[PDB]
Amino acid sequence: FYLSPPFIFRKGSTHITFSKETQANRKYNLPEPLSYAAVGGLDKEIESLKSAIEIPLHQPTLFSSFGVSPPRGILLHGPPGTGKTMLLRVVANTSNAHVLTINGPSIVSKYLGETEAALRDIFNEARKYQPSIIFIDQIDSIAPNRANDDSGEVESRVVATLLTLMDGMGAAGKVVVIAATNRPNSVDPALRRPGRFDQEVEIGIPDVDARFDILTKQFSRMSSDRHVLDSEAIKYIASKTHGYVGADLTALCRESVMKTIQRGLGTDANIDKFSLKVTLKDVESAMVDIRPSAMREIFLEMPKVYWSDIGGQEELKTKMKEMIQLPLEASETFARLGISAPKGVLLYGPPGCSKTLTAKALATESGINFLAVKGPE
Amino acid sequence: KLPAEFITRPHPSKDHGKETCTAYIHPNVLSSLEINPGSFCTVGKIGENGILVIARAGDEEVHPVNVITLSTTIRSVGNLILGDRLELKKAQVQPPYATKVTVGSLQGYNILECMEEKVIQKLLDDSGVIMPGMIFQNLKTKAGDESIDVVITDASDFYLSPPFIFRKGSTHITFSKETQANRKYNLPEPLSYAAVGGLDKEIESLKSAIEIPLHQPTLFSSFGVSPPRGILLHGPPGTGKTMLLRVVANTSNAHVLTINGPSIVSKYLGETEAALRDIFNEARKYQPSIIFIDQIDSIAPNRANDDSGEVESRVVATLLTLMDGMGAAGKVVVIAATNRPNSVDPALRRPGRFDQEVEIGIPDVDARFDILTKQFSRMSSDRHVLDSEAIKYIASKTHGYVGADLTALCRESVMKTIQRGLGTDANIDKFSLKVTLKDVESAMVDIRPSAMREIFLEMPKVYWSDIGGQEELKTKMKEMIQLPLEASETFARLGISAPKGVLLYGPPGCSKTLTAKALATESGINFLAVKGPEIFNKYVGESERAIREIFRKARSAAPSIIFFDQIDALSPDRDGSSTSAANHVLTSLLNEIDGVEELKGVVIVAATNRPDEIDAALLRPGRLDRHIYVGPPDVNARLEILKKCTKKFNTEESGVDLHELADRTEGYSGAEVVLLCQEAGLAAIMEDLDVAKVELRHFEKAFKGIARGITPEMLSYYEEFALRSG
Amino acid sequence: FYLSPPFIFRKGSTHITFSKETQANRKYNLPEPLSYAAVGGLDKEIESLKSAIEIPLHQPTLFSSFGVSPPRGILLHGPPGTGKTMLLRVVANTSNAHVLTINGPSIVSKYLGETEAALRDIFNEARKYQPSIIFIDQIDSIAPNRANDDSGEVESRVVATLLTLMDGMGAAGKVVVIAATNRPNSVDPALRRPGRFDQEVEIGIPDVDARFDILTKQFSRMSSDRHVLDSEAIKYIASKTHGYVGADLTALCRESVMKTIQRGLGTDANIDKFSLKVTLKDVESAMVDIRPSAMREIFLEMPKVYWSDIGGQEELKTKMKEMIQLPLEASETFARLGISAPKGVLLYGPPGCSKTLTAKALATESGINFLAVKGPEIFNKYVGESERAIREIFRKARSAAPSIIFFDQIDALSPDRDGSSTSAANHVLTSLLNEIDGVEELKGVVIVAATNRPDEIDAALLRPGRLDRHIYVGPPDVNARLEILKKCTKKFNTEESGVDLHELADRTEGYSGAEVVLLCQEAGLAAIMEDLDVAKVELRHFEKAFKGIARGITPEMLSYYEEFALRSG
Ligand SMILES: Nc1ncnc2c1ncn2[C@@H]1O[C@H](COP(=O)(O)OP(=O)(O)OP(=O)(O)O)[C@@H](O)[C@H]1O
Ligand SMILES: Nc1ncnc2c1ncn2[C@@H]1O[C@H](COP(=O)(O)OP(=O)(O)OP(=O)(O)O)[C@@H](O)[C@H]1O
Ligand SMILES: Nc1ncnc2c1ncn2[C@@H]1O[C@H](COP(=O)(O)OP(=O)(O)OP(=O)(O)O)[C@@H](O)[C@H]1O
Ligand SMILES: Nc1ncnc2c1ncn2[C@@H]1O[C@H](COP(=O)(O)OP(=O)(O)OP(=O)(O)O)[C@@H](O)[C@H]1O
Ligand SMILES: Nc1ncnc2c1ncn2[C@@H]1O[C@H](COP(=O)(O)OP(=O)(O)OP(=O)(O)O)[C@@H](O)[C@H]1O
Ligand SMILES: Nc1ncnc2c1ncn2[C@@H]1O[C@H](COP(=O)(O)OP(=O)(O)OP(=O)(O)O)[C@@H](O)[C@H]1O
């Protein structure tokens, strides 16, 4: 209890000693504030969001002189697990301004007027203190499209009161609202307006270099002595991860840690778990063990067959390998030549020769997410 | 007897240079607030740290306890307009004397009444404190039946504006001209008629329908007709209804009550009507009152649907009864604004109550130009360099940009200017930079119109130079798209509209979709892409709603281009084998294209692979007028495609002339040439890993590997259909 | 805070003089009495209602010994805004008797017994206090049909007790109750079953005649001076906007007054409005700008079109005019002579033959009101919403003379394709058949339908009451094509170009109006593009635009239409 215990100071009994450590001791498991360096691969979006939040919040004289109203709300949309919530958390921690944790549908209650009274109280509290930020998560559910036949009445009322609070007779004062959702289409079109939600950022799936940056940031956050790795090894791991996101990378790293712990336990009995180290083959094993988030909804498995299993002509193997692996293994040559992959093959011939076995071999030793669909399915 | 909120009313006595900066307060309130009559008392409009440091004691019980009388001159700094809520704060701090102050005339004239023989007795002989800035009526001070207004701007030596104590001998008055108050400290300002542009024909009607029922109710009623009481404003969201309501509230000398929010309803059964009754009684009792009800659709839902079951239905019933209860004796006007005109209950929309309905449409080129010019005039002159011609050109470029999108465009242009200055001038002051046309174009590229927000289309940018095919199709598309928009005066003079019909039929994969992508990239106009079977839905009638919504979005997003890719998917319903959904979708499409309501500006483009499967109803004139053969590319087109694809490759190093190869690929198509080039590049990649050129052997191998898909039978059928069409 | 300031009067200490007219000063804000003269036009309905209400309200001793069911109601109903409330007020004021009644917004009570005891006490007082007229407004709101599940709640016992209680004090005794409602078919059929509502007097919207009379009456009522009094102007404004109800007329008068006020202020810089006078310009501006509730709830209006803008086979126009004007102008000739008009025409033909344009012109000329309805539009996701929507659009929005319903594509409703049972299309077709087989003359609905593929129409829909009139709607002839070419070439300079506009029409023999318009548009666009603005068209432009037209009307569909017409007979 009491989180971290306190202590009593004395003039001559402390015996202050100086140590070289930025962070506090980890034995107290105290929360660590987030910094902008934690998020990687999104430099342009981070800079744009930071500017669009800081400028309206601080020194609004620039906008007052120009006669243009400062932006009011910012909407963040993208695939789940991309890092929008962590971005909101880090921008809340870094900015020294009032925040209001309107997490979700906690505003609506069984009472008829409570669902609007709570929002009015929140907006009044935000307006009372000039530096204030509003962080809305899953705005689609609380404020859905009114045109839909399933919208209802209380949802329409809450949408109307949100619209009135954001824009109306009572103009907002130097307050910014941040909304995060995974389905921007479900958001009411009235909310997505230049007067309310002009600033829209589409946080897409990270690409290869963004994934490498995220992995490097995670490894830098980890202690240097905990794991030994090279920059080329991290780049190779990032290249192997195709459909991975920040959540997928975190899950991969955690699974690698667990695999390292279990390998140490197996190799040495009653050994210290903190003395183990993470190697490249361990990360590869964790990667092959775990599954990407996008492939979770796909449920199909086949026995593992290798490239050596297919007995036949090598021309098909060479052509399909040059179609598949070349754009990913060496993309600089394609970029220089300005040519893309053909992206298409048709296998026509006598039944049972090489088609389904080739598909299985690709699904096994392709290193890429595989999707199988049937004709009449 | 301790009300939470205090309302305000103007002083009954006219301004005469005395009793200014005094707010009468009921003795009961002063005793409860332990504030003596002589002190500095601050009032604010629910927060915002509003300050007025004025305190006075009311006389007997004639002054209502809830209301506080505020002078017109002192009410200008707080922007309160006849009914703004007021909060009492007993804490105060004695301010020091002011050693510097300036006076600025509101009018364009400068240096007026320099002697100040009688002016000094007004703003200098008064014992009460004077804010750094307000608006003075000054009554009449200049000969020639003209009244001047003075607005003090600067004053030096938690609160919104620090009040300064003045004295006649404290310092010297530096009279000058600085228009309104300085912007070094934030200060609310009124919105005038010049703020709203492009709505003159509607603003005059609104002015009349506000002034006549308020200023002269009985004078108008003398003829024998009840004066109008309800005004309804409806239109697309973000058009300027809220600004119009704010302007008519600020410029009017009548009480205003804000009941736009759904806060009128309460959990208690009786309160949702008691609050409305109290508000209407307060509006009627004081006499000159204006009522604004935004989002009336949520407050008063339609009774036709099952959504408005009990509570909102009884709210509408009570509102209707209380609206019909009042007579023509009082001077009260009710203003209702909503995004959906059809969501209002038909009971409210009646000639006896809501006859005066004003529709606000999407601004045209002239209205957009007027709005842009007014916004630039409001913006500081030294902060902008664009002239009238640039503003007109920008307005012409903007098609579906409503005033909200125009304001967003201006803000984004300012942000782009700031970013460019920071990047180029190595952290120079942001205030020194000025907006230019390049920043405006960059902001236009960055910002999409609000009407296209619901449509997500991530498409690669392809220009007309990339398509090296036949120039006849490009010329026809340009003459159909850009020509009517560029010069509509000639079309109006000649009395001919736009054909707005394209039927792209030909070999698959040659050029139909590429023209759609090319048009979307290099048209500068809103582009809508609709797939063939993507509109079908499992439920009955949901495809109807989807197509109606798509057409409504296209209509509301200015003239635009609709690309119906593979229109033949849902067309053929010659018998009962096809489901009724396809026939209903086809009928709805025909009705939306021509039907009964004419389509102006929007262009329908259809690309198909089987023109015969399309029903003759869509083939009639007025739907898909223009027909393009768009066959296989010619020798020149194929040579251009080969040159474009090989431009990255080293032609001179290899020695290929790009002519023998072009002659060899006579029977191929547009996509087959690209596939052959890709195969040659892949072979060059495999031959030596890294390479910067392609040799003739790779081209020969690719040509051997290419399988022709343009069968002569398909070309014969297409040419037979073409000759049948004629 | 009084209706009028009180005073003190004496005999010899004050002077008494008599002058002015009957009407009192308007500065007192006092109301004015309402008489039967205050209402014009409806009067034909009023004559029937005053007679029927009056025989019971006056001497009802005639049916004393008869013992038949006593007449205690009229059941007034009609289109919304028809002015029933002013008729009720007039009949209440002129009766100079007790008018004890209450409407309420479907007034109920939370207590189980009080919600009925209130009505019982009201009826007991009415029996004791014997009011001449009792007003029951909005019967559908307070007592709708029992067919709907949610409609029968609460009101069932109320209406049952009302029915079983109103059958009292027979022979002698007036106790006449007036039932006024907006929806005629929403009333409970069991409520209409007894014979006291056998008359079912329904008041229609003013039209054709008496409109100028009521306009003059309302103008005189508002002010006998400072206004224009011209018979020709009033007749013209009555003829214009034939679909305007009396409430729309009052709104027009109010907007004309507003326009006069605005013009006077803008002209004389806020002068007193007593001397201002009303002119025709402000009336026309008000008529343009009112947008009354008659065309509301639609938000869309058909484009303007005139007979000069369209030139076509005179036979079709003559047949359509005979179909529309003859029953619409009057109905007593049809009723007395027994003529049964088909009240329905089917427009089938090749696409682009301007059947929809013909319907638009018909609505613009005679109807002066259009109600555009689309087949697939009435379809709804819910099973029961489509039937309710089609019933609403068929009944509530229908007006007797003004409104005509036009079907863009009627062939998309009847065919259910491979539908066995429980289908939305089958349900809507059955509802339409039920709501169309019970109408013969009614109010001159004269529905009009257009189609492109007649072969799907004959699916349980073609009935002898609707196939009486068939219009071939053939392609335009050489004269019609020449007229279309001349109309489209009017903006061009024929004299400067020298084109005779004859050989072009002769060459285009198999074309129609749509193809002619398209080729003229293409020629104009080419002329604009080639040399900017030239204000003329040459023969080369027509030659260039000739290849743009895709064939035309192919003979196979023409033969199919001909054989379908022969089969129909
Ligand atoms: N750029 C990143 N760098 C490091 N870790 C990341 C990054 N993006 C995501 N993660 C990890 O993935 C987790 C999921 O991200 P976050 O909690 O921000 O949710 P989100 O992407 O907004 O999605 P949801 O829709 O589920 O709220 C983070 O807590 C973090 O551990
Ligand atoms: N070259 C080969 N090497 C190894 N096994 C083979 C080979 N050719 C066929 N087989 C075996 O025969 C089976 C039949 O081949 P496969 O399942 O790929 O069928 P297919 O070509 O897709 O034909 P179909 O779907 O028309 O029946 C394989 O699953 C495998 O067990
Ligand atoms: N005529 C106009 N001139 C200049 N700016 C305009 C105009 N109309 C709208 N805007 C801009 O759009 C913003 C939104 O307009 P406004 O606040 O008046 O709401 P509204 O049009 O009534 O819409 P909503 O129903 O969404 O509240 C304004 O704050 C202003 O920046
Ligand atoms: N004339 C051309 N110029 C440039 N590229 C071309 C040309 N013709 C074909 N291509 C290339 O070939 C591809 C195939 O053409 P595309 O699929 O766009 O044609 P389409 O006829 O509209 O399509 P589909 O018939 O499949 O609906 C194009 O995307 C482009 O990359
Ligand atoms: N004979 C008449 N002469 C003049 N005006 C008339 C006449 N009959 C009706 N009116 C007009 O009709 C209106 C009377 O409206 P009323 O209060 O009766 O409601 P309503 O709209 O007819 O009701 P509901 O829709 O419930 O039947 C007034 O505008 C009045 O001028
Ligand atoms: N006599 C004519 N005068 C003027 N224009 C005409 C004439 N005949 C045809 N047209 C033109 O051709 C068009 C054909 O009519 P419309 O487009 O309404 O289709 P429709 O013949 O009713 O066919 P569909 O069954 O496809 O609706 C008219 O709208 C008009 O532009």
Residue numbers in the entry:
A (entry chain C): 209 to 585
B (entry chain B): 29 to 185, 209 to 777
C (entry chain A): 209 to 777
Publication excerpt:
Next, we prepared a mutant form of Drg1 with two mutations (E346Q and E617Q) located in Walker B motif of the D1 and D2 domains, respectively. Similar as in the structural study of Rix722, the introduction of the Walker B double mutation allowed the capture of an endogenous peptide within the central channel of Drg1 hexamer during purification. In the structure of the mutant Drg1 hexamer (Drg1E346Q/E617Q-ATP), a polypeptide was found in the central channel, which passes through the central pores of Drg1 hexamers formed by the PLs of the D1 and D2 rings. The density of the main chain of this peptide was well resolved such that we could build a poly-alanine model (23 residues) for it. Thus, P6 of the mutant Drg1 hexamer should be the “seam” subunit reported in the structures of Cdc48/p97 and Rix7 in substrate-engaged states.
The type II AAA + ATPase Drg1 is a ribosome assembly factor, functioning to release Rlp24 from the pre-60S particle just exported from nucleus, and its activity in can be inhibited by a drug molecule diazaborine. All structures display a typical three-layered architecture, similar to those of type II AAA + hexamers, such as p97/VCP and Cdc48, and the NTD, D1, and D2 rings show an apparent deviation from a perfect sixfold symmetry. Comparisons of these structures indicate that Drg1 hexamers transit between two extreme conformations, a planar and a helical state.
